[PDB]
Write a protein that binds this ligand. Structure first.
Ligand SMILES: Nc1ncnc2c1ncn2[C@@H]1O[C@H](COP(=O)(O)OP(=O)(O)OP(=O)(O)O)[C@@H](O)[C@H]1O
Ligand SMILES: Nc1nc2c(ncn2[C@@H]2O[C@H](COP(=O)(O)OP(=O)(O)O)[C@@H](O)[C@H]2O)c(=O)[nH]1
Ligand SMILES: [Mg+2]
Lengths: 68, 206, 352, 326
């Protein structure tokens, strides 16, 4: 069972699907960023949630979505 | 009592200690030097050096207490103060230019003046001497009348004829009535001063 | 008046206005916010005879983001989070007021926690017998949604025939207001009438007819638990409610031409500890996954400038009547007892 | 054996709980159509139509309300069984008010459905005839501590004696909860009580919408019919602890239900005593679940007045609507 199993696999996960859909839609409207984002997400999902982790997540999402 | 008789009560007043040594009189200097030798009790939970501390409101809250529930009693007190403040602001906004100089919005002044308007100066002492019971007038001490004002206010606000009106709203209305020399508490003071006026002749039985 | 700013247009606030109060007109108050403002801020508005909001860094950052928003990209989810009573609801209201002045379509949910608890009249949806309706909660929202967006209800026109009953149906091309009216008149079709509205707004905004703002306060309620029960005393999940199921579709970034703004809230939350305030702790795994990816924005306590400005505003309204409150010692005591928390400071100033 | 809190007690309502639309919300549930068909077979008219769509004036007639309440109560039992099998499985006590007792026994497997309907029909007809025999009524009175009930009954009888009648009747007919009673008797006595409430220290008085004086000796003529109707019926041993109304204790042996059921017809209802016998316990001990299987929520309010803590775990079965269309 996934809940018993002790890992959030970023691969084939909801986070991966959501970011892929977002990036495809941005390309239609018109990497290291994805690596940073998935690192932040996996840290938040597996380790403890603190303000530093939330800020890292924020910065990664901003860089991926072209928000400054 | 877990305190020895040696222990003296603490003096929380914060400006008393800041008094310059020059202003101290020899008696006051002696008292201050004496206090060094004495043992002092731990200051109780309650009174603080806070500039917003008000002993009268603290006593009123303690008298509304039921079963040691101080949180709820203080909640009711702060709600009453807020309600009085809001009603005064509402009456201040709707008042004419000249009537806005005679509207007091400070709820603490209203509370103090309302309690002062309910203090009786003369009361009675139940005394049976000749086999039949006799009321006799007496002068009430200041503590006794201060207590009676609060007790009458609380008993009036705990009346059952007020169905489902919450205590902060009842108490704010009674306080605003007594601020203007109106209401049943002022009538209770008057029916005591009159019914002790009807019994001046018994005053020789003191 | 050092605590007030003459600039009452939210589109022109900047970092120099940080800590100053700007005024919301009565017309803007009645149109933009029939339901938005906190219950204890309505009291301040009624007693001071004016609604003045401070300009803070959370709202300024979230306005800088919404000014530079690409309407071709999918809608970006923003999430305001912070400790209790730190002002995130009023930051959300600041943003809603900014967006309403630029002729955005406002979809404002004042408190999503009210849809998952203390509901008497639950019905089984004739549209789908597996979900439940909340006519009183839906018809209450519909009237105020109509009030906020009266202008657009005739410009926006449906694109499908909706069958309320065999006798009554809304024909294609009718103005959206009709649907809203059908929800306001007959409460039986209130919950069906909310979803249709959402279905239109999420669609037509993509076409480019208008910009849509989805402002949901207490967004953490959608992926939590409910205190609602069946007639067999069994629990009901949040997804079983049509009102909550139709609002989750609006949180997905499968549309463009707008922005989705939300604010967490532990106040009124179900099955959460008092000190839980971070996004995952309130949202849950499901909530975080649903909102992921999203931009979190922190709302903190007053810094010294904001605290001093709030106390100067209260003194300028003569709301601090204690003779010691204006003095510096009174201000230090206020600062310590509230620790610069806006809600605690307001509550303590209420009875001074 | 079972911890208090996982067992359940079923309360069956009685006269005065009828309502138009009763039965809607139970009709779709299992087995209910067959109960109503059997009721049609035994009575001779359509209860279903009268209960679902009625003027409420035919429904308030004695001959019609009692069978309607009986059938609706049992239908609610089947509804609860469908929704919560465990609650019916873990049932410890059962109790009916006046006619609901006939329902409770049927739920306890002491009587069968057709037997119960025949008994209730004969009972209702005889009671209506007895009410027609002499004018009478009932009054609900809520007293305060200074209120004396037998005292007020005594002057209520003195007044009607002064007017002139053979043995005026006015006595407490229902004990509901502390200081709330229902007195029963000739209308003049009850009017005397109404107009002299202040002297008698009665806070509230409300004439019940009833045909006549139930639970008094005035219903003696109806006793002999019901007994005959009950003679043929072979009452078995109740499966659950079903309480009586005459003396408010659990029925011991089936050979005494025959006479206790006819004695209830001319005896006061010991409802407060029954609630005590079911829910009394020491401070802190848990209480069972309570389900009011039938129309209305009157027994719920009575339980609230009697025992608040037992009322904390109280629920009522909806017989006017249903959440899910089964
Ligand atoms: N920007 C602001 N301008 C003026 N007052 C504010 C502001 N932010 C907060 N306050 C004060 O704080 C009080 C509570 O703020 P608010 O309702 O926004 O809290 P919150 O952070 O959303 O908390 P909760 O978890 O209770 O929802 C407001 O009534 C007001 O008194
Ligand atoms: N009364 C009525 N409501 C409708 C009709 N169509 C859609 N709705 C409502 O509007 C909402 C539209 O959301 P939708 O995309 O259809 O979600 P889904 O069909 O349940 O998967 C639905 O939840 C319905 O409650 C209709 O033809 N008649
Ligand atoms: Mg909030």
């Amino acid at each position: 069972t996934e809940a018993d199993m002790e890992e959030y696999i970023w691969e084939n996960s909801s986070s991966e699907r959501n970011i892929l859909e977002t990036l495809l839609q941005m390309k239609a409207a018109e990497t290291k960023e994805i690596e940073e984002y998935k690192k932040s997400v996996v840290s938040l999902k597996n380790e403890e949630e603190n303000e530093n982790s939330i800020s890292q997540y924020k910065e990664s999402v901003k860089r991926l979505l072209n928000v400054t | 009592s877990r305190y020895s008789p040696e222990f003296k009560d603490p003096l929380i007043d914060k400006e008393y200690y800041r008094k310059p040594v020059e202003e101290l009189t020899e008696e006051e200097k002696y008292v201050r030097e004496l206090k060094k030798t004495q043992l002092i009790k731990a200051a109780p939970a309650g009174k603080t050096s806070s500039v917003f501390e008000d002993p009268v409101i603290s006593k009123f809250t303690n008298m509304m207490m039921i079963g040691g529930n101080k949180v709820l009693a203080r909640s009711l007190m702060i709600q009453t103060l807020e309600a009085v403040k809001r009603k005064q602001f509402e009456k201040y906004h709707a008042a004419s230019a000249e009537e806005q100089a005679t509207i007091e919005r400070n709820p603490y002044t209203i509370f103090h003046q309302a309690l002062k308007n309910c203090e009786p100066m003369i009361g009675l002492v139940p005394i049976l001497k000749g086999g039949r019971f006799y009321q006799v007038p007496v002068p009430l001490p200041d503590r006794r009348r201060r207590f009676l004002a609060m007790k009458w206010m609380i008993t009036e606000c705990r009346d059952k004829k007020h169905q489902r009106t919450l205590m902060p709203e009842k108490l704010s209305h009674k306080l605003l009535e007594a601020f203007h020399n109106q209401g049943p508490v002022i009538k209770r003071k008057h029916d005591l001063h009159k019914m002790a006026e009807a019994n001046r002749a018994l005053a020789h039985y003191r | 008046a050092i605590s007030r700013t003459n600039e009452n247009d939210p589109a022109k606030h900047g970092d120099q206005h940080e800590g100053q109060h700007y005024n919301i007109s009565p017309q803007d108050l009645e149109t933009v916010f029939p339901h938005g403002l906190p219950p204890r801020f309505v009291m301040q508005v009624k007693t001071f005879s004016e609604a003045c909001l401070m300009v803070r860094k959370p709202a300024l950052e979230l306005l800088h983001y919404l000014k530079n928003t690409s309407f071709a990209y999918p809608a970006i989810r923003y999430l305001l989070y912070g400790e209790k009573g730190t002002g995130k609801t009023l930051s959300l209201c600041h943003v809603i007021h900014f967006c309403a002045k630029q002729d955005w379509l406002i979809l404002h949910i004042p408190d999503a926690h009210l849809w998952v608890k203390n509901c008497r009249d639950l019905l089984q949806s004739s549209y789908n017998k597996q979900r439940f309706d909340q006519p009183l909660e839906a018809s209450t929202w519909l009237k105020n949604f109509k009030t906020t967006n009266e202008r657009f209800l005739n410009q926006i026109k449906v694109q499908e025939k909706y069958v309320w009953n065999k006798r009554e149906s809304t024909e294609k091309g009718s103005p959206l207001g009709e649907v809203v009216e059908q929800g306001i008149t007959r409460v039986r079709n209130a919950t069906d009438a909310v979803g249709i509205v959402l279905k239109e707004l999420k669609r037509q905004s993509s076409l480019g007819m208008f910009h849509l703002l989805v402002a949901v306060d207490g967004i953490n309620a959608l992926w939590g638990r409910t205190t609602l029960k069946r007639e067999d005393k069994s629990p009901i999940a949040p997804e079983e409610l049509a009102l909550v199921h139709n609002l989750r579709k609006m949180m997905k970034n499968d549309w463009h031409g707008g922005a989705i703004v939300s604010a967490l809230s532990q106040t009124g939350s179900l099955f959460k500890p008092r000190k839980a305030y971070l996004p995952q702790e309130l949202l849950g795994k499901e909530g975080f996954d649903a909102l992921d990816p999203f931009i979190p924005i922190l709302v903190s306590n007053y810094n010294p400038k904001e605290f001093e400005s709030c106390i100067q505003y209260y003194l300028e309204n003569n709301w601090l009547q204690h003779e010691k409150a204006p003095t510096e010692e009174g201000k230090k005591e206020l600062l310590f007892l509230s620790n610069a928390n806006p809600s605690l400071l307001e509550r303590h100033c209420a009875y001074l | 054996r079972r911890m208090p809190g996982q067992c359940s007690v079923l309360l069956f309502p009685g006269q005065g709980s009828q309502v138009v639309g009763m039965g809607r919300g139970l009709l779709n549930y299992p087995r209910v159509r067959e109960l109503y068909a059997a009721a049609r077979r035994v009575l001779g008219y359509d209860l279903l139509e009268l209960s679902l769509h009625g003027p409420q004036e035919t429904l308030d007639r004695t001959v019609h309300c009692q069978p309607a309440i009986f059938v609706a109560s049992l239908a609610a039992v089947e509804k609860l069984h469908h929704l919560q099998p465990s609650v019916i499985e873990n049932c410890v006590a059962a109790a009916g008010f006046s006619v609901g007792e006939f329902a409770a026994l049927v739920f306890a497997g002491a009587m069968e459905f057709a037997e119960g309907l025949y008994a209730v029909k004969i009972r209702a007809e005889a009671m209506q005839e007895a009410s027609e025999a002499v004018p009478s009524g009932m009054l609900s009175v809520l007293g305060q501590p200074q209120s004396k009930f037998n005292f007020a009954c005594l002057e209520a009888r003195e007044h009607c004696k002064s007017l002139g009648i053979e043995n005026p009747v006015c006595e407490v007919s229902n004990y509901l909860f502390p200081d709330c009673r229902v007195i029963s008797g000739h209308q003049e006595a009850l009017r005397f009580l109404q107009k002299n409430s202040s002297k008698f220290h009665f806070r509230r008085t409300r004439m019940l919408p009833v045909s006549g004086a139930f639970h008094t000796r005035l219903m003696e003529p109806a006793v002999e019919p019901l007994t005959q109707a009950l003679k043929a019926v072979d009452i078995k041993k109740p499966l659950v602890s079903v309480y009586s109304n005459v003396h408010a204790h659990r029925y011991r042996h089936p050979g005494h239900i025959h006479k206790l059921l006819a004695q209830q017809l001319v005896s006061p209802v010991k409802w407060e005593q029954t609630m005590h016998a079911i829910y009394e316990r020491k401070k802190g001990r848990g209480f069972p679940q309570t389900f009011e299987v039938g129309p209305g929520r009157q027994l719920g309010a009575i339980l609230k007045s009697c025992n608040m803590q037992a009322w904390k775990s109280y629920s009522a079965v909806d017989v006017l609507q249903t959440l899910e269309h089964v």
